[PDB]
Symmetry: D2
Subunit: 368 residues, 4 copies
Amino acid sequence: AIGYVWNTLYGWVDTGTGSLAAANLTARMQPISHHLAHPDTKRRFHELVCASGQIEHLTPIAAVAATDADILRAHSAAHLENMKRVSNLPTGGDTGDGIAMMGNGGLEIARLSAGGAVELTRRVATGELSAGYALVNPPGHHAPHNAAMGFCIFNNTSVAAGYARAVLGMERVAILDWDVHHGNGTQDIWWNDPSVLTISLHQHLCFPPDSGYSTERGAGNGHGYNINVPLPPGSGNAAYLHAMDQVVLPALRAYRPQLIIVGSGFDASMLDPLARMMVTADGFRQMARRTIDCAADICDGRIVFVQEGGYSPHYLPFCGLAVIEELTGVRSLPDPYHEFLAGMGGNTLLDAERAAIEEIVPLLADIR
Amino acid sequence: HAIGYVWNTLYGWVDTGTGSLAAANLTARMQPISHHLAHPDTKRRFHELVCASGQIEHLTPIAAVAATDADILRAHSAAHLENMKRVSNLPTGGDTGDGIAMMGNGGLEIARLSAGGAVELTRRVATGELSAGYALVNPPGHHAPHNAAMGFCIFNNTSVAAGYARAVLGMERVAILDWDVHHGNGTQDIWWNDPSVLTISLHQHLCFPPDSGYSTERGAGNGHGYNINVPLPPGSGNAAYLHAMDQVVLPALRAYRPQLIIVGSGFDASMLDPLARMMVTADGFRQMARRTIDCAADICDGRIVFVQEGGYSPHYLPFCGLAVIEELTGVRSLPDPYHEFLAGMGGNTLLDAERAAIEEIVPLLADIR
Amino acid sequence: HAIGYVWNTLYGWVDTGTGSLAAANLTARMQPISHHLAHPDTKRRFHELVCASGQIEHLTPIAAVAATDADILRAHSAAHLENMKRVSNLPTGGDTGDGIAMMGNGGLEIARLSAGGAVELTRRVATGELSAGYALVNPPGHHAPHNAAMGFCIFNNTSVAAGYARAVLGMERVAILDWDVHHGNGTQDIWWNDPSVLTISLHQHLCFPPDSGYSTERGAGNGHGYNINVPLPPGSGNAAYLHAMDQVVLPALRAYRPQLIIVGSGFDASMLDPLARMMVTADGFRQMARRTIDCAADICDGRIVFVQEGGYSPHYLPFCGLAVIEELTGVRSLPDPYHEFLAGMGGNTLLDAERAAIEEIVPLLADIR
Amino acid sequence: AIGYVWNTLYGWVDTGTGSLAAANLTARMQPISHHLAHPDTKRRFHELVCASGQIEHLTPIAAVAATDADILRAHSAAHLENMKRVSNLPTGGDTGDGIAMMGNGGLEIARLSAGGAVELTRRVATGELSAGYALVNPPGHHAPHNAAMGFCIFNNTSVAAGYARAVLGMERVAILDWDVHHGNGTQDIWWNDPSVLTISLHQHLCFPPDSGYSTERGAGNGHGYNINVPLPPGSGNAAYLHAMDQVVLPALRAYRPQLIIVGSGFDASMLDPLARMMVTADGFRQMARRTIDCAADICDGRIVFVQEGGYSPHYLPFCGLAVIEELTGVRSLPDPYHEFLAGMGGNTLLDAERAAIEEIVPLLADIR
Ligand SMILES: O=C(CCCCCCC(O)(O)C(F)(F)F)Nc1ccccc1
Ligand SMILES: O=C(CCCCCCC(O)(O)C(F)(F)F)Nc1ccccc1
Ligand SMILES: O=C(CCCCCCC(O)(O)C(F)(F)F)Nc1ccccc1
Ligand SMILES: O=C(CCCCCCC(O)(O)C(F)(F)F)Nc1ccccc1
Ligand SMILES: [K+]
Ligand SMILES: [K+]
Ligand SMILES: [K+]
Ligand SMILES: [K+]
Ligand SMILES: [K+]
Ligand SMILES: [K+]
Ligand SMILES: [K+]
Ligand SMILES: [K+]
Ligand SMILES: [Zn+2]
Ligand SMILES: [Zn+2]
Ligand SMILES: [Zn+2]
Ligand SMILES: [Zn+2]
């Protein structure tokens, strides 16, 4: 039984009238209808899940708002209180860093996003469901313990892992983040903690600018339980699948988590504006198949996918649908971009890609 | 014969936000939307049609020049100007006063260019360099009274232009004719006590503002008799508007003998506008413009300046505006492609209630000395 | 008490092209635009508000089932059905007949789901599984006559539903009440000779179609007297619409004693609609729905099915639709955030011309046997 | 004196309701407001030229519709007649290959696009202007002699080169195409002809799928007078500037054209969805500066830029503005994305990038 979370308000996140930062007349950044992170991209994924007929093979799960207690398992009280404050401003406002704003009442949506991840986690962990996909928005993985960053208000996968640890009593949880940007927030939250293995595959130095190096390995008892796999621009299906086979799956098998949470972004796709990677829907399909099969082998199938980034309203729906189909086992729609993208490359493992991945292999032995 | 035309790229860059009218609001469940009712694309589509139709070849482009503080202070209070500076300097922009309409960051630059476009065109018509013109400005003006912003308006563009004509050009009498479908309350307020600017507003009765635009609002002191409101009922169309022109507006202008006529030219009385219930077609606006231009020829050596006010149909407004431009250039080269569709809907018969609304104003003409 | 609700994702995927009303056309200088007047976002925003408001929790979701050829042929000719198959099979889609409205490629799938959503809801209300419901379908129906598509409509959804109630459920009398602001010419045509479906249309006089909807259009043969048009003047608001309900519509339904009432529920009579000139507010639609639901309770065991027709304000339509949903669920949990803004504009006084238009229809009630 | 062409109708090109191909319900490709190639991207470039104040330093040049005779210098009569036919269809239609459609009356815009390139070429070549930028749409470089392809109806730069050859009597013209996709159309048109040197820098096998190899060198008298520089995905400023210095500028100096036409796309930008390259506005600035200075040295400054592709409505305006500023010499606006993008990389010449460029150096000796 496969759970699926969508909430209407995920599609109502107010991203403003700028492109990335706000529109700014002095800088001559003209207003635009769709910010890069506009919610339509993820809503189109949801609408494809429905229109394709996948929804008939899924068990819809209503999001339940994350409580203050839920949020405080991942974040500081000061951060939570600041998000309450900003959300109460009549226009919304600056969430801290001056780039990403939050719209008025936006905390309601941020709680439903974290809460959708928690609710799905609860149902999968207790055995009500075998697995699922939480198509949440706003995203999570850049928000560290004490701040919002990178379009993220709360770290949804960390709120879910915190819940699995504290409420469900799991001793080991893994978060695998294949969003193309470094999961700095998740890395920060669990830095000193070996009970949550944090893995991030990402384009090297894409975002944030100063993080995601292979030398960032945790601290204290957590040393060895953070794994970064920075990959070069232009990496495609061959690099990603080699990273899965050489690093990710062996790390999960070594760690023996009781639950795998996937921070599932699709911004590594061939058509994404916010990175330079070459993954196709078939690549994401294979990544999901491998991870689901790994869960079947090591943690009784307990795997929860939670939406992170992705910025192609054209193509992201088909990348997401491929993952859904691997969960349901019903493979009923082709990728209509397949012919167009398959000739572009990414399907050969380049020497620089291989080398980037091999850098991480000696770190596997420190996962006890 | 030389017809001025003002468009500035930044008129198309006004940031109207992500709400419909007020801001988006999650608790109220007002979902964000790409195009606010007042989004600048409507007016930009008008500009683009002026160009694509070939009308631009018959126009003399006139660059907007930013309105100075001194220009603005002829229509507005120092406190209002300072408040607009303050709001424009806020990092996200903010509330211009009424709680509904926001102004984006640095937006004062565009407000100055909008008012300044009206001033520049007025200057160049009044000297005789140009015979007439159209200033396709944004943001609009006619709701902003002396001491505030209101109704999407930051500065009262036509009043800044009239103030310039009075103080800098020394004209003794100026008329502002406002056929935007909403009451020109701002213009009325600014010149309330002043007989040297005749203010006329045709509008849908109580459309916006809610408490405003009655025929009993006639000015005060020396200005008593030099404000004329013509409130019309919902559903009024070409017949009503042309009867109002013939019975009230043109006689008022002839009685007053302005040295310059400024037209607050909105197209929100159109048959397809969401923000009013009127039935005017492009041919109606054409006839309104022709009548007014011919009146200017008769009484003030042709000195007429059109200044864009409202209008909210991105589909149809361009053709209403193009009709007015064609009356200025005398080059009538494109049909209204909506003509057949709209002509059958009505508005072309003068209804008794429409006639009566207009006749209410006729006895006030005698007080225009 | 169980209230059915139909939404299908594909209702939001109807491809309305890149024109405003007709296609974009370069020679005519009709610039392309992102949102056609009839773009599906308007109705999708209604659905999203039903969900976000929490109304969805009080509704029983009912899946659309594609209308079969047999379902469609109860309302339409075989030639019409075959033509829609043909057009839907063209690689880009194409002209559905009138030259204005296009249908996108594969669009027949959505037309079948739209009609089928109405049928499914009708079936489940008529059995007593549900007490009532709202089918938020798209594309709309009421302009499509027996032999053609027209006015954005491919199949006449409410007539497909009525045909099902008559032929499959064996109901002897069905009523279709159409308060979309445009004349239900299609529905009128289909049931013209047939007294077993009472067809009532309230509409702005001659809004669309242009030659249609007069009070003299009363049916023919055995159907004479079982079509009722109530043309209303531009500018009519809540007072007119509620007077029409009380003087004409409700008495007609009580005289006829239908076994099921189907409401063609458009919201294009709203105060903010671009495609008509009426002044109805969400509170007006609320009162219209309440009256009709209470009438159904009195005369046909509550069997009432609402089926979405038109409406073109993405800003305001959601709140008009939500008011109707709240009358069905009895859960009144969200204000209309436009109430203050619109309440001052008028429409709340019954004008003499509005009263007279309605009184024209009262003598026709006696012919409903 | 710097010429600048914009025509309102360049912004009115009807790209439909699909993403790339048409919307298609059976494939579950949901309609969308903005096709990848929607004209707003280029219109935003024009509006920035105006709002930045660059327009005050430019001489606006009205487009003049390309005549049949103009078009026939680059294309077959059958192609021209087919475009007339498709343009006359009530909805427009299929321009030949089934992917890119042309809207009704669209031939008018295609003539104004080619004609804008011709008119600017005429004024620069005759000495009325020193240089200029024709911000045209639809684009040109994929249209070969006998067909439309890749959003291109007519090959604008080839129509302009044909005019320079036949009407102005220039013996040698060069077309340098730095659009990220291979200029297959331009390559095809001048394949057998040494009097037009055709150079294309591009992402290897991005589009079209089967072309742009270094082995495509022309034929007959034209052998040696087509130069392809395929570059790997992820190439940025360092690779592009190395290609300019090692291949492009030496090729131009060897050839001694009497006019340089630049097919100026910005789809190699860091934020483009339709390629995987890493060029920033400063990169395009340096490319333009180098090419303009080369023209000053070898052909009395006669250089004409003609817009090709580019698909970031956010960033393309700033890339285009950088080129305009190099033409006017007035450098009055910062790139507001500079900090955000500068940390992402592309500024180091990688071994695979260097090698790709060095593959072309031995071909320079065959340019006589
Ligand atoms: O703002 C940014 C880039 C933001 C990119 C966010 C990606 C978010 C995400 O997809 O991973 C996800 F979280 F949505 F998943 N950088 C700056 C800003 C200022 C100065 C330097 C760099
Ligand atoms: O906000 C509005 C409606 C605003 C309509 C502005 C029309 C502007 C204009 O076209 O005339 C022009 F100025 F642009 F020209 N009403 C309220 C708000 C609160 C309470 C009651 C009514
Ligand atoms: O095309 C139109 C107007 C179309 C308006 C359709 C309204 C559709 C609807 O809301 O009722 C509903 F069906 F969607 F519900 N008129 C012409 C065209 C040619 C000649 C004269 C008039
Ligand atoms: O349609 C495409 C990709 C089109 C990309 C066009 C780029 C155009 C351009 O920017 O260079 C410029 F010309 F605009 F400049 N490929 C297919 C389609 C079907 C099957 C395989 C591949
Ligand atoms: K850890
Ligand atoms: K990651
Ligand atoms: K006055
Ligand atoms: K007015
Ligand atoms: K009947
Ligand atoms: K009706
Ligand atoms: K050649
Ligand atoms: K190229
Ligand atoms: Zn990301
Ligand atoms: Zn107005
Ligand atoms: Zn309607
Ligand atoms: Zn390109």
